[model samples]
Target: MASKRALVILAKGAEEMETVIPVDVMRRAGIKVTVAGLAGKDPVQCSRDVVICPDASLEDAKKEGPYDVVVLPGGNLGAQNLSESAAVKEILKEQENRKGLIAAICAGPTALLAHEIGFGSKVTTHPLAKDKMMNGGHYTYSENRVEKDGLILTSRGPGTSFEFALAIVEALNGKEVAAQVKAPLVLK
Candidate 1:
């Protein structure tokens, strides 16, 4: 069977840990992951002093999708850029049309609202975005860790990235598989 691909969209000012931690968890769980740059070939810097090289650019990566899942990590400027991208918007539209899974965290969930991907969908984002999200009629406030509404998953902040990723792993790969991956990391 072909492996399921998890696409992580990276843009300028992305939160470092939110992007990397989830990708690491997904990969450790035996999932294939691709980091796609929303802008260009130049490496994108994160808030936490980490640099992520995109596996592919947005234009190029856009063609690579029909992905099994898409992950959006949160940072103020990065999330805004990503949410506004024509290509990213298209991906969200396609994912919605197909009922595919999408996982986003922190300001990342705000991107879904920008793309109209999570309207009437319960989701969690950075507390600061709560009023904005509610006012947009896109989501309801939930606990700040992780939430799953059908195929869409939302998490709060960088603090929950690992649990957010692990949740996605469980959702895609099954509980047994997720537990297997967690065991080695000594994560409950």
Candidate 2:
């Protein structure tokens, strides 16, 4: 079988750590990861004033092939940017139809709502968005670091991104490999 492929979508002001740590964990697990950016370039800014380089462009990745998993990292502004992208919405829709995994962390969960996947599914995001999410009736407060609802996974914030990523890795690859990946990070 081919290795699992993960697509990390990036936009301006994305949380660098959230995107990077998970990719690192997955790669350590021997999985293939492809980073795609809306602008398709280097020097993308993170929420905390860091810059990152994307492995591919949204345009190219959308046309190139299918991914086994799709990851959306969180950032206040980046989430808004992602929600407004038509191409991103289409790709996510395709991923859902394919029964692929969709994972979001922090404000990243809002991106799923923008994609219209928040209708009746339980998900968690930044605490501030709790009221807003509850208003939509598509989410329930998990009060935990991460919550997995079938193929859709949601986590709290940038702080919880590592655990969220590990959860995704574990879910697909089993706990043994996940534990191996987590051990190096000193993550419990």
Candidate 3:
């Protein structure tokens, strides 16, 4: 297969592990990832104060899109920012219209709800976000570590970040590539 491209939407106060693990894991699986800052090209202060620089702005990344996968990482404030972004709304709606894979972890899924992207899919979010994600009963909720309802993939909190990342690898690349990347991580 040719190289697959991924777009990661990064916002301030995002969970560092949730944002980075999937980027690293996807790269390990030989997928090209673009970490796009929602605010603009700059370093973002994550939920835990770990700072990360994005490769580009979401505005620029949106122009470069039609990516194979689009990922969202959850932080309470981060998700809220994403939830409120008209740019994010357009990107996700376009991605969903194209039927590409959309992945969200923890509070990230809450953004999907705000954007009205995957309303009928089965999803799981950080337990703390369950009420917000389920507020309108738009989705069938689950508690699984990783949940994939068609092209929409969702996971729980930081502790499940690795599983969430590998699931994206598996979805974009294959089980074997995901396994190859997983073996060296020493994950249980």
Candidate 4:
């Protein structure tokens, strides 16, 4: 894999920590991350009122596609917004079909349920999102901070974002790259 790319869907009311941490860490791992605005390329006010500007629009990023990973960051409202997007469903389905890595954090995994992307895979989500993500008994659930079942990687809330991001890096780049990146983070 030559400089794997990641597409992070950035919607309004998204968790700022969940969204920014992954983007920042992924970039440090040499992964090109595209923070795509779900509605448009405008500054989005996150769940905690932290504003962020996405790099592009979802429509535009779709064309730039075939990204190695598609990241979904969470906040109750943000995940709901993502779950309601037909375009997101399309992209996720395509990514799954290609065996690409799909990463979701916090309430973000609920969108995977909505899109029906990883029905039988084991996943983890924010504690509060378990019911929503497990609706219809589609997949197995785990309480781990980060859970990776094949190409679908899921994680808990903001507290686990770093682990989630590092997992993505390891999946795309390999163990050595992940370790090299992790050494500087000083994460015990």
lDDT of each: 0.86, 0.83, 0.95, 0.94
Candidate 2: the clashing residue pairs are none
Ranked candidates (lDDT, high to low): 3, 4, 1, 2
| C-alpha lDDT of residue 40 in model 1 | 69
Q: Candidate 3: which stretches are off by over 4 Å? A: none
Q: Per-residue lDDT tens digits of candidate 4, residues 63-136?
A: 99999999999999999999999999999999999999999999999999999898999999999999999999
Candidate 4 regions exceeding 4 Å error are none
Candidate 2 matches the true fold with a TM-score of 0.94
Q: What are the per-residue Cα lDDT tens digits for candidate 3 across 1-188?
A: 67999999999989999998999989998999999999999999999999999999998999997999999999999999999999999999999999999999999999999999888999999999999999999999999999999999999999999999999999988898899999999998
Where is the poorest 10-residue window by lDDT in model 1? 131-140
lDDT of 2 at 140: 63
Against the correct fold, how does model 3 do in TM-score? Answer: 0.98
lDDT of 1 by residue, 1-188 (tens): 78788889998888988999999999998899989988866688887768888888877877877888999989888898887898889998998898889999888888888888867777888888787667756577787589998988999988888789889999989999888888878655
> Per-residue lDDT for 52-163 in model 2, tens only?
8788888887787688888998888888888889988998999888888999888888888888874667788889767655666666667778988888899988688888
For candidate 4, give the lDDT: 0.94
Query: Candidate 3, after superposition: displacement of residue 107 in Å?
Result: 0.3
